[PDB]
Design a protein around this nucleic acid. Structure first.
Length: 56
DNA sequence: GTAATTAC
DNA sequence: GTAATTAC
């Protein structure tokens, strides 16, 4: 639910709340966290790395 | 190559 | 079915 600074497919930076988040690694095993985002301007979906202590 | 996830 | 998301 924490907003994140991401670059959109339109090439603008924005502070968005990811629609869905997860860590890319087996459950309990640690890896990079990824968010699914949606661009308010283009409507396009995109993914972006999340900050490491991001609440999953 | 692949981890997890999913829009397309 | 594929590529997008980073990092190993």
């Amino acid at each position: 639910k924490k907003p994140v600074k991401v670059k959109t497919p339109a090439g603008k930076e924005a502070e968005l709340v990811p629609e869905k988040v997860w860590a890319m690694a087996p459950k309990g095993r640690k890896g990079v966290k990824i968010g699914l985002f949606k661009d308010p301007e283009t409507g396009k979906y995109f993914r972006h790395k999340l900050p490491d202590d991001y609440p999953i």
